Amino acid sequence: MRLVRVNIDNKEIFAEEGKTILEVAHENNIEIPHLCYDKRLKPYGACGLCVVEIEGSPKLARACSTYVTDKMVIKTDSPRVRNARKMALELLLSEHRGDCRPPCVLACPAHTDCQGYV
Amino acid sequence: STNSFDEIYSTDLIVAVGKVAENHAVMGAKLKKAVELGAKLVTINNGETRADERAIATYKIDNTAFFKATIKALFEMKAVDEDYVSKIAVNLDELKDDVKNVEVTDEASEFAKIIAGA
Amino acid sequence: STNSFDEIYSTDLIVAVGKVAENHAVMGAKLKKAVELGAKLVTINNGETRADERAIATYKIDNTAFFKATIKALFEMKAVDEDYVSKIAVNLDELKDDVKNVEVTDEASEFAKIIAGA
Amino acid sequence: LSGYKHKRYEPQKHPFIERNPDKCILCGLCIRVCEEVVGVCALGFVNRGFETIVKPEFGLPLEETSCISCGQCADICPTGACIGKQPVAKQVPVNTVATKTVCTFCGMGCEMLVETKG
Amino acid sequence: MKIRVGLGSCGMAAGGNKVMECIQQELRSRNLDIPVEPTGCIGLCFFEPLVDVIDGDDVYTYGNVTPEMIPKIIESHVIGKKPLDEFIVSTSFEPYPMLKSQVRIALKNCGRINPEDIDDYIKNGGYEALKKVLTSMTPEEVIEEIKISGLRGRGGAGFPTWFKWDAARKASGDIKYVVCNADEGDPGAFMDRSILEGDPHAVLEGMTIAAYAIGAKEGYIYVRAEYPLAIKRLEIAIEQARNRNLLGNNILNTNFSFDIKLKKGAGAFVCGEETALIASIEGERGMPRLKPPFPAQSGLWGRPTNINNVETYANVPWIITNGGKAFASLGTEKSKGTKVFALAGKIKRGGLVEVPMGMSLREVIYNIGGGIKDDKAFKAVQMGGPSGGCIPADLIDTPVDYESITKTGAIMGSGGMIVMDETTCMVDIARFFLEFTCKESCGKCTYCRVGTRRMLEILDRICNGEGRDGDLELLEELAVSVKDGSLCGLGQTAPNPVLTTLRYFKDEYIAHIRDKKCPAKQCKALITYSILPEKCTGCGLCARKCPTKAITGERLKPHVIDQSKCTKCGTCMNVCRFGAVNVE
Amino acid sequence: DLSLLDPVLDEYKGEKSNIIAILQKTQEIYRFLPLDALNYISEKTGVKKAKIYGIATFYAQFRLKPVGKYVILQCQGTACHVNGSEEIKNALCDELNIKPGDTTEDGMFTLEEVACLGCCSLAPVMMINGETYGKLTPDKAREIIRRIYEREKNV
């Protein structure tokens, strides 16, 4: 078929027209964060973790809903993108209540999984 | 080399210098494919090449002065953002002094116009 | 079974009989996906089902006579190529005699119209 | 970016699915999968803005809604706000090993990954 | 002879309904036959109720009318055959100066017609644009006319209306839709409401012309249910237009057929967004969708949809009648036409104004608005509302123009224009706008859902005196992150008041944070009410007016405040006429 | 009650896009949104109960609890707030001993903040069951509340 040419993280990729940046990067083993995406569902654009920097666009684009076009240059780990993802994650952690690890595990100097083996 | 072989298929303009297709036939095939995909080919050589068939500009030079004039032309048409180059490069004023007295030819000016427009 | 599960996504019309979605929820999801892809759904059951939401025709029957009437209706609209059926099937005249005295209802005629038009 | 944090977690009697609002990142995936894939549509957004929560129909317990206990919401959840209870005597977060096999409870032949430890 | 009473949303909020009832009763008891009509807001909302007595072509606008003055007016003008000239506020021969610098296009008929009678609109050059378009004009000709006119937005970010119309027209579909934003959104803007209450037929005709240009067969008006007067007048206008073959099937005895259904909004600032208005119309919760597909390509129920404001639709009949060039000869080289501004806040003369583009904000305030209330100082104008920004006094010369206002960090917006003087805290204003944004956010994306709330928490800490040092740069970083990461325009424009106030009024933030003092003396947790013993006279008014009974003292002796039980409600300043209480 | 909803549901039957209009009519009929009425709307309209609850809790016009006899729409637009409307709301809250959005235990008053009421020139403005009050002041607002209370008690 007709193939679009993209540049994701300095790597030239011949992708297929009609895919999103998330799918193209998944195929080429490029990790883009995502929390509200699912291949069975229409895009939602909520979390804002999949934002990538596309050369020629002043605003970061969601990789889950943006489609790859011919002669595209994409950065997925630029400082702007990292700052955006860090701020989104901090906002998400702002409204979060939980224990990733129990206090017993954190009090062990060797961090033995006390809860796990108990 | 600065870039990879794949980016040839996606670049706007290709400048092939020397017997690129003669010494490396597969590179001649790659240039043919890239021009078919939408690139623009400029061949600089001292004789005939198989890449001249689909080239938009063909230059038969024998001296380095052709490039120097080009540089001067690039300065005359204000195609060099000296603010950026001064931060990223040194010896810029020496380059300007070196190429100030050369004569800009029609071929050199056309090459400079092709370069600046890509 | 005569066909495979994949062909459901490509068939023109789906007739789901019984508690297809209730007893097998994944088949209900598959019918939802197939109707979204472009199929037409007809549900025949004695009660409510989750597949009635996107069905073009919903029939609440309690007796087999319904289908018999459908068959008679199929004969009335000349929707049965009796030459081909006689070549491939036996007991055709017995079938015609069996369904000749039944009463064709509006529901049965509509079902026969849907079947013949697919 | 720390400040007011909701505390809206209430214990539930459901034998299979446990929902914690305090760990919800409001990606909407549970709602979108119950509506778009399963088709039951038992979950929805409640309130608006910072007060937004994910709740079953009318805030009822999952048992009293139209939920069919498929577990798709708990399977799609990214951040442990919807989990499927382990079929063991005491709940323990463990690292498991997954083997692919076939469900034997109806003829749809759905495949699954059974995650075990010991 | 005719009598008109100004029954706008503000008209019945100033006693206009009772004035009309008294006028009718007086006319009936006097045995007189004089028509009495309602009318919209002429823009002099500080003179309501307004009674226009019409003799032939002469109009006399009495203002601040009262039921007690009504019999005198009736017996001296309607019966006495002589203008009273003592309570007269305006007249056709000498109009009010506030109406002399205004060029009116959208508000051409506002306050000068009967909103509940189609014949009055028809008499004043009404529906002739629709007749001309339906008789001898191609839809491409209509789009080209709007393109030449330069109409753009009038209540949005500002986009060429011709581009939206052409995009909707060229799209493929048996059915296309033409929607209208009767929602105001901005808490403090009332231009759309007043236009619908004073000129619904202009909006209807503009919608019909837009449909003819596009090819639509059905249109929707999205008016908030909180505005009953606008809904009632729109329903009356639609019925009257239908009964005259001006709306519905076979409009004006031609193949065109356009109809309008009023879709009442349930109330949400997010619902003003295009992809959220579409969801609200479709019955779902108004959660904004992603940009592809666009409303023009596929909007309501997956069909092409053209969403425009009320004012840009009211501009259309004028453009069609007077030509595109006439509309394009007003304004600047980029923004052309007139813009409607709702002047409010600390202003001497507030209300609806319609100013040509390129007019300086200083001309809008000091020349049209009359200056500042109580002739106090002038600090800033909040242009745009919660999505807009504060243009300070030193940028008062920016012309009314999308580019010029945008260059100052504000936005033109719907047109709300709140003037805040030296007694209004900028940090408090940013906090108020962020509180509104957090209360009206759809809560789908974490940047708007959490970023706005966290920014509000920072501003609350600053206002409450608990603001830790090192919060200005973190507030700026939150604002930039929220602006560049949110999904819809509610979150991408929410940081604008915070971003602007931190550019022109950063010293207020510093004083709130470093010195822990309020330069404007507005934030309660940073001010103090103290009684100077010399100035007090011991009348006991302040002491009796305290909800907390803070101030105690003897008669004719200086009262002493109780700082322990003072809630800083500011009642002392309002009740002490001797200047004894000092805030600092 | 679940009897008056029949004509409202019948005039909007056949389309699952009229649900907000059905909710508005339901709130008009019952003065609030009852859960049984929402169940009936979901059953007849064919819309899922989760979506009904989502719409009912998304919009500000919809209230899930009974609302007292008198509603105090206290405008909180930009013009009123600049003109000192926060103190009016605080005074009303202190006088009625309730928080914004709530109703008094007596079931008599219900303070709700609203956007611009249109009459910016009378800022601050508050509306009580149709009646309007402008150019107010904390003391003045308390006086209006006291006068309404005394006038109703005398009857």
Ligand SMILES: Cc1cc2nc3c(=O)[nH]c(=O)nc-3n(C[C@H](O)[C@H](O)[C@H](O)COP(=O)(O)O)c2cc1C
């Ligand atoms: C949060 C938000 C609220 C909005 N509210 C309104 C509104 O109340 N009225 C309006 O005309 N446009 C509003 N808009 C602008 C719309 O996106 C859009 O511009 C408008 O419906 C039509 O644009 P127009 O100016 O070309 O007519 C809003 C935009 C956003 C992001």
Ligand code: SF4
């Ligand atoms: S507490 Fe649980 S849900 Fe929250 S981040 Fe940690 S592991 Fe994830």
Ligand code: SF4
């Ligand atoms: S278990 Fe299945 S049916 Fe129940 S809420 Fe979750 S996704 Fe919906």
Ligand code: SF4
């Ligand atoms: S999938 Fe999990 S995190 Fe996402 S909305 Fe549902 S419960 Fe919340």
Ligand code: SF4
């Ligand atoms: S095979 Fe049948 S019982 Fe098993 S998961 Fe699939 S649908 Fe359910």
Ligand code: SF4
């Ligand atoms: S910015 Fe995000 S959370 Fe805020 S209204 Fe828009 S879509 Fe909803």
Ligand code: SF4
């Ligand atoms: S500010 Fe209010 S509480 Fe304090 S002394 Fe004055 S009237 Fe009393």
Ligand code: SF4
């Ligand atoms: S109102 Fe003024 S003069 Fe009168 S007792 Fe109070 S402080 Fe003294």
Ligand code: FES
């Ligand atoms: S994955 Fe959440 S915004 Fe794209």
Ligand code: FES
């Ligand atoms: S802002 Fe309150 S009446 Fe306008």
Ligand SMILES: [Zn+2]
């Ligand atoms: Zn007015």
Ligand SMILES: [Zn+2]
């Ligand atoms: Zn302050």
